[PDB]
Amino acid sequence: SVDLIGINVAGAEFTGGKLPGKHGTHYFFPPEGYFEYWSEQGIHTVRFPLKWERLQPSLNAELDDVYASLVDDMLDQAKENDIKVILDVHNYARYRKKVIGTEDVPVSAYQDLMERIAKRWQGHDALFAYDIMNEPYGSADKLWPAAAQAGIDGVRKYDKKRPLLIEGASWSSAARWPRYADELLKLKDPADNMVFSAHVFIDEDASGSYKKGPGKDFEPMIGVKRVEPFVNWLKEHGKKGHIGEFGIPNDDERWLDAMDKLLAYLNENCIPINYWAAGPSWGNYKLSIEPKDGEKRPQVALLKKYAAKDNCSDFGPAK
Numbered sequence: 001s002v003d004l005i006g007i008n009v010a011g012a013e014f015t016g017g018k019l020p021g022k023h024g025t026h027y028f029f030p031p032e033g034y035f036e037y038w039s040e041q042g043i044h045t046v047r048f049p050l051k052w053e054r055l056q057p058s059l060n061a062e063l064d065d066v067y068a069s070l071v072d073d074m075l076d077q078a079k080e081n082d083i084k085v086i087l088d089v090h091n092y093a094r095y096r097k098k099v100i101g102t103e104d105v106p107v108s109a110y111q112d113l114m115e116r117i118a119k120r121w122q123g124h125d126a127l128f129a130y131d132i133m134n135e136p137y138g139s140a141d142k143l144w145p146a147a148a149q150a151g152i153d154g155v156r157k158y159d160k161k162r163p164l165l166i167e168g169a170s171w172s173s174a175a176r177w178p179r180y181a182d183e184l185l186k187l188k189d190p191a192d193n194m195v196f197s198a199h200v201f202i203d204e205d206a207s208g209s210y211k212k213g214p215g216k217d218f219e220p221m222i223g224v225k226r227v228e229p230f231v232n233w234l235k236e237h238g239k240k241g242h243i244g245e246f247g248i249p250n251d252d253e254r255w256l257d258a259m260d261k262l263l264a265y266l267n268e269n270c271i272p273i274n275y276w277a278a279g280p281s282w283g284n285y286k287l288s289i290e291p292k293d294g295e296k297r298p299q300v301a302l303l304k305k306y307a308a309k310d311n312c313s314d315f316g317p318a319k
């Protein structure tokens, strides 16, 4: 194996209002040669958001051939460049804005999605894991543990080996994790390869919009302090963990120092991270680490420094 250092490659999920949308206009897959740059930077694990509505435009029906073939090609490019890919269903536990478990989107439809995903890509060597749902929140919170078991059951029908990244309620917040995660203790995986994946940003409101600077009394351990509730819950309940989303702006050294402190804490506990974000068409996005002319990405140097640290033998923390 598990790389502690990885990146999100975002784009295939953009412009949720345009369904199905057109590739190259509303959403974007990595062009040819994209993964070569990141491979040569020493990054070998990628989290890849996908939009459920584009992969499966009708519930319980087969996957869209056009959208799924773009995923096929992406996985092919990743394989050629020694990139391991975590597929992320980036849908906030909703399908066309309706929560999984309501009458319009029963858990059996979500189970059907995960079956087809695993059936189609269980054989691709570039596929590393399944992040079965990005950030359940709000009215999805109480229904999410039942939906999660259905997603687990869906993958495990066709993929009995690969890890399952299980996110939590309340945008899978690492800071608030123990206040919701106990309902995930009843989740079952016959393969015993479940990893819980929480998210964290270090701006004031923790939204990752970074509308403000670090601030006068900024605490460098803010990142560690916001993941401590998550990591302690992992140790207390003997579970494995993962940080699927974290990013910072490039315009203040205090952000970088806080990121350094977080990566060390995650290293000490063997918790992998997926930086948010890289991607082929982020433009002026403030958290982007994709190369752009005239823009410095000091976050990448920090990622490379910690990628050089001996990858942990399994997901931490150790029991």
Ligand SMILES: *[C@H]1O[C@H](CO)[C@@H](O[C@@H]2O[C@H](CO)[C@@H](O[C@@H]3O[C@H](CO)[C@@H](O)[C@H](O)[C@H]3O)[C@H](O)[C@H]2O)[C@H](O)[C@H]1O
Pocket: 010, 013, 014, 015, 016, 026, 049, 134, 135, 199, 207, 208, 209, 245, 276, 282, 285
């Ligand atoms: C975790 O929190 C992240 C920070 O809020 C959040 O990032 C948001 O990601 C979406 C896409 O997944 C972005 O929307 C796209 O933004 C570009 C313009 O920057 C636009 O062209 C696209 O059409 C939008 O879809 C959004 O800007 C980010 O804030 C993650 O998604 C969360 O999982």
